[PDB]
Amino acid sequence: SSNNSVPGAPNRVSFAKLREPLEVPGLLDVQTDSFEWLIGSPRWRESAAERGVNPVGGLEEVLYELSPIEDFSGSMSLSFSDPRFDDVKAPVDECKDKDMTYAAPLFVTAEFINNNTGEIKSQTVFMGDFPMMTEKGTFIINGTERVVVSQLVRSPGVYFDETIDKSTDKTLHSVKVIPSRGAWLEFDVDKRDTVGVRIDRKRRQPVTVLLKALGWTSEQIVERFGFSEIMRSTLEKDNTVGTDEALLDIYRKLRPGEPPTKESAQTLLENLFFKEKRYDLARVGRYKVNKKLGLHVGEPITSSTLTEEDVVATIEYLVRLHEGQTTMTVPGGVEVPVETDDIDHFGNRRLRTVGELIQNQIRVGMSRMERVVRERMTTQDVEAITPQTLINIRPVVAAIKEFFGTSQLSQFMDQNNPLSGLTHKRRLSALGPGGLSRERAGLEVRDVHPSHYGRMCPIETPEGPNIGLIGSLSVYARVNPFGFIETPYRKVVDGVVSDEIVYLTADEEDRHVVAQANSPIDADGRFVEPRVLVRRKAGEVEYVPSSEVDYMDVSPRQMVSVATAMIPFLEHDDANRALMGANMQRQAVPLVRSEAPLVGTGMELRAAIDAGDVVVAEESGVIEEVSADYITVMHDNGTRRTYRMRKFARSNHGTCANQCPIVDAGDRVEAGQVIADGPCTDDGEMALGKNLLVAIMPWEGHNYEDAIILSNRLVEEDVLTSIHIEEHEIDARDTKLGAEEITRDIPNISDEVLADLDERGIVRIGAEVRDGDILVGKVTPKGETELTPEERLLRAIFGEKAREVRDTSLKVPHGESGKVIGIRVFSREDEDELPAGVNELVRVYVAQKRKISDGDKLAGRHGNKGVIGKILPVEDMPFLADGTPVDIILNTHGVPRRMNIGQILETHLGWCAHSGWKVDAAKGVPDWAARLPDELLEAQPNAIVSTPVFDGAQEAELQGLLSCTLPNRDGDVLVDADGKAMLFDGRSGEPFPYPVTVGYMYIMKLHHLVDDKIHARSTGPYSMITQQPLGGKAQFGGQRFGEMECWAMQAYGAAYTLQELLTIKSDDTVGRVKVYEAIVKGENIPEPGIPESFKVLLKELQSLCLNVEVLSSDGAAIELREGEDEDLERAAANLGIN
Partner 1 sequence: LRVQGPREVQIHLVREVQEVYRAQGVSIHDKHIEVIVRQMLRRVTIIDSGSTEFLPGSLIDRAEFEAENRRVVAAAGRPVLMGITKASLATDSWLSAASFQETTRVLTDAAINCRSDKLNGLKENVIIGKLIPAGTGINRYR
Partner 2 sequence: EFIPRPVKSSFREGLTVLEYFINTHGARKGLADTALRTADSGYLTRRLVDVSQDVIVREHDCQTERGIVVELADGTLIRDPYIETSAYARTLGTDAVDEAGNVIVERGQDLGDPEIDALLAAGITQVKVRSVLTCATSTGVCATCYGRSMATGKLVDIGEAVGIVAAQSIGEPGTQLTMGGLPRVQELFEARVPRGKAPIADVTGRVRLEDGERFYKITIVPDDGGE
Partner 3 sequence: QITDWQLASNAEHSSTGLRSAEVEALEALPDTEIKEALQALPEEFRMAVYYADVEGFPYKEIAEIMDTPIGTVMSRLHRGRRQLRGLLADVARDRGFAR
Partner RNA sequence: CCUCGA
- For binding to partner 2 (CB under 8 A), which residues are involved? 443, 446-448, 453, 458-459, 461, 463-465, 467-468, 516-518, 533, 535, 541, 553, 556, 558-559, 569-576, 579, 899, 901, 950, 952, 954-955, 1043, 1047-1048, 1050-1051, 1053
The minimum distance between CB 727 and partner 3, in angstroms, equals 15
Q: Give 352's contacts (C-beta < 8 A, 6+ positions apart).
A: 150, 151, 153, 360, 434, 483
**Which is closer to DNA, CB of 64 or CB of 184?**
184
The answer to whether the CB of 237 falls within 8 A of the CB of 194 is yes
484, 886, 1016 from 853: Cα distances, Å:
47, 17, 19
Residue 673 identity (one-letter amino acid): Q
178, 184, 187 from 200: Cα distances, Å:
11, 6, 11
Site string for partner 3, 721-750 (x = CB under 8 A): ---------xx-x-xxx--x----xxxxxx
Query: How far apart (Å, rounded) are the C-alpha atoms in residues 411 and 803?
Result: 45
Residue 1091 near which of partner 1, partner 3, DNA, none (CB within 5-8 Å, type-dependent): partner 1
CB-count burial class (<10 Å; 0-12, 13-18, 19+) for 432: middle
Query: How far apart (Å, rounded) are the C-alpha atoms in residues 1063 and 1061?
Result: 6
Residues of span 1013-1052 touching partner 3 by CB under 8 A: 1018-1024, 1030-1032, 1034-1035, 1037
Residues of span 785-804 touching partner 3 by CB under 8 A: 786, 788-790, 792-798, 800
Which residue of 533, 1034, 1097, 1117 would you call a contact of DNA, by CB under 7 A?
A: 1034
The answer to whether the CB of 691 falls within 8 A of the CB of 597 is yes
**Which is closer to partner 1, CB of 341 or CB of 1067?**
1067
Query: How far apart (Å, rounded) are the C-alpha atoms in residues 768 and 312?
Result: 78
- After which residues is the chain discontinuous, taking C to N > 2.5 Å? 52
Query: How far apart (Å, rounded) are the C-alpha atoms in residues 546 and 569?
Result: 29
The answer to whether the CB of 886 falls within 8 A of the CB of 912 is no
Report if residue 183 touches partner 1, rule: CB under 8 A: no
End-to-end Cα, the chain, rounded Å: 93
Residue 72 near which of partner 3, DNA, partner 1, none (CB within 5-8 Å, type-dependent): DNA
**CA trace torsion 108, 112, 113, 119 (10° rounding):** -110
CB-count burial class (<10 Å; 0-12, 13-18, 19+) for 221: buried
Q: Write the DSSP symbol of residue 312.
A: H
Residues of span 53-92 touching partner 3 by CB under 8 A: none
Which residue of 317, 403, 1068, 1075 would you call a contact of partner 1, by CB under 8 A?
A: 1068
Which stretches within 293-347 are classed as H helix?
A: 308-323
The answer to whether the CB of 492 falls within 8 A of the CB of 552 is yes
Query: How far apart (Å, rounded) are the C-alpha atoms in residues 1091 and 588?
Result: 45
Q: Write the DSSP symbol of residue 919.
A: -
CB-count burial class (<10 Å; 0-12, 13-18, 19+) for 780: middle
Residue 178 near which of RNA, partner 2, DNA, none (CB within 5-8 Å, type-dependent): DNA
Residue 573 near which of DNA, partner 2, partner 1, none (CB within 5-8 Å, type-dependent): partner 2
587, 685, 822, 1081 from 563: Cα distances, Å:
11, 13, 34, 59
Q: Is residue 682 within a helix (H) or strand (E), and if so which, with residue range? A: strand 681-682
Q: Give 1106's contacts (C-beta < 8 A, 6+ positions apart).
A: none
Residue 1042 near which of RNA, partner 2, partner 3, none (CB within 5-8 Å, type-dependent): none
The minimum distance between CB 1070 and partner 3, in angstroms, equals 10
Which residue of 833, 1077, 1083, 1100 would you call a contact of partner 3, by CB under 8 A?
A: 1077
Which stretch, 534-542, 983-991, 1035-1043, 1063-1071, contacts DNA (CB under 7 A)?
A: 1035-1043
The β-bridge relationship of strands 838-850 and 818-827 is antiparallel
Residue 434 near which of partner 1, DNA, partner 2, none (CB within 5-8 Å, type-dependent): DNA
Q: Give 900's contacts (C-beta < 8 A, 6+ positions apart).
A: 572, 573, 574, 577, 578, 581, 862, 863, 864
Query: What is the total count of residues that contact DNA (CB under 7 A)?
Result: 56
680, 849, 1027 from 715: Cα distances, Å:
19, 11, 44
Report if residue 873 touches partner 3, rule: CB under 8 A: no
The minimum distance between CB 192 and partner 3, in angstroms, equals 48
Which stretch, 132-140, 683-691, 1030-1038, 1064-1072, contacts DNA (CB under 7 A)?
A: 1030-1038
Positions touching RNA (CB under 7 A) are 408, 411, 414, 429, 431, 438, 462-466, 469-470, 583-584, 587, 865, 1008
Report if residue 967 touches partner 3, rule: CB under 8 A: no
Report if residue 1094 touches DNA, rule: CB under 7 A: no
What does 207-268 look like in DSSP terms, one character per residue?
A: HHHHHHHHT--HHHHHHHTSS-HHHHHHHHT-S---HHHHHHHHHHHHSTT----HHHHHHH
Report if residue 142 touches partner 3, rule: CB under 8 A: no
Task: Supply φ then ψ for residue 506, to 5 degrees.
Answer: -65, -40
Report if residue 1029 touches partner 1, rule: CB under 8 A: no
**Which is closer to RNA, CB of 357 or CB of 787?**
357
Of 335, 322, 326, 324, the C-alpha closest to 293 is 335
Residue 429 near which of RNA, partner 1, DNA, none (CB within 5-8 Å, type-dependent): RNA
Of 255, 341, 903, 816, the C-alpha closest to 597 is 903
Query: How far apart (Å, rounded) are the C-alpha atoms in residues 1056 and 1086?
Result: 12
Site string for DNA, 647-666 (x = CB under 7 A): -------x------------
Which residue of 56, 956, 1101, 1133 would you call a contact of partner 1, by CB under 8 A?
A: 1101
Residue 414 near which of RNA, DNA, partner 2, none (CB within 5-8 Å, type-dependent): RNA
Query: What is the total count of residues that contact partner 3 (CB under 8 A)?
Result: 59
Which residue of 1050, 1118, 1126, 1134 would you call a contact of partner 1, by CB under 8 A?
A: 1050
Residues of span 1103-1132 touching partner 1 by CB under 8 A: 1104, 1106, 1111
**Which is closer to RNA, CB of 535 or CB of 865?**
865
The minimum distance between CB 1037 and partner 3, in angstroms, equals 7
**Which is closer to RNA, CB of 38 or CB of 413?**
413
Report if residue 1028 touches partner 1, rule: CB under 8 A: no
The minimum distance between CB 1026 and partner 1, in angstroms, equals 13
Q: Where are the beta strands (DSSP E) in 150-229?
A: 150-154, 157-163, 172-178, 185-189, 195-197, 205-206
Counting every residue written for the chain, the total comes to: 1138
Which stretch, 185-193, 720-728, 997-1005, 1128-1136, contacts partner 3 (CB under 8 A)?
A: 1128-1136
Site string for DNA, 205-244 (x = CB under 7 A): ----------------------------------------
List contacts with DNA (CB under 7 A). Answer: 72-73, 142, 144, 152, 154, 166-167, 176, 178, 182-184, 190-191, 200-201, 258, 343-344, 349, 364, 367-368, 374-375, 378, 405-406, 412, 430, 433-437, 439-440, 442, 444-445, 654, 1012-1013, 1015, 1031-1034, 1037, 1039-1040, 1042-1045
List contacts with partner 3 (CB under 8 A). Answer: 730-731, 733, 735-737, 740, 745-751, 780-783, 786, 788-790, 792-798, 800, 806, 808, 1018-1024, 1030-1032, 1034-1035, 1037, 1072-1073, 1075-1077, 1080-1081, 1127, 1131-1132, 1134-1137
List contacts with partner 1 (CB under 8 A). Answer: 1046, 1050, 1052-1056, 1058-1059, 1062-1063, 1067-1068, 1088-1091, 1094, 1097, 1101, 1104, 1106, 1111
